[PDB]
Amino acid sequence: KETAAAKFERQHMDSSTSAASSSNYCNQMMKSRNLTKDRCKPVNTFVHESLADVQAVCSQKNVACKNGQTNCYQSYSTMSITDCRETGSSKYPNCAYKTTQANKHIIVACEGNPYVPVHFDASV
């Protein structure tokens, strides 16, 4: 089975490029990272920072997760990200996305030993 931590890297980590280079990006990346398999996943975010920078967030600002748990962490600095958001006309299996680059703080849920990101909660 895929670990939660590896799933986070697959769904949210793209260190290779520093900033989007779009409008292709979300369409190819959602596809290539297996996020258009079961459904068109409506929203997803990719983080354009080193794995180490993102992992470090687990020891930064402790905040409440959206689901009411306490194991979420907000990055002290903003990070280069890309929000992928399905279009109104997107129909499975041909999943269509709008690519939006931004620099924002990320919020991630962390667990396990080692204590690493396992879910992307939000950006702010």
Q: Which residues are catalytic?
A: 12, 119
- Is 11 an interacting residue with respect to Ir ion (CB under 5 A)? yes
* Nearest residue (CB) to Ir ion, 11 versus 15: 11
Site string for Cl ion, 47-86 (x = CB under 5 A): -------------------------------x--------
Give the H/E segment covering residue 9. helix 4-12
3-state secondary structure (DSSP) of residue 15: coil
**Gap between the Cα atoms of 106 and 103, Å rounded:** 9
**DSSP class of residue 97?**
E
**Gap between the Cα atoms of 30 and 73, Å rounded:** 24
* Nearest residue (CB) to Ir ion, 32 versus 89: 32
> DSSP H helical segments within 33-107, as ranges?
51-56
Which part of the chain contacts Ir ion (CB under 5 A), choosing from 27-35, 46-54, 84-92, 95-103? 27-35
Q: Which residues bind Ir ion (CB under 5 A)?
A: 1, 11, 29
Q: Which residues bind Cl ion (CB under 5 A)?
A: 78
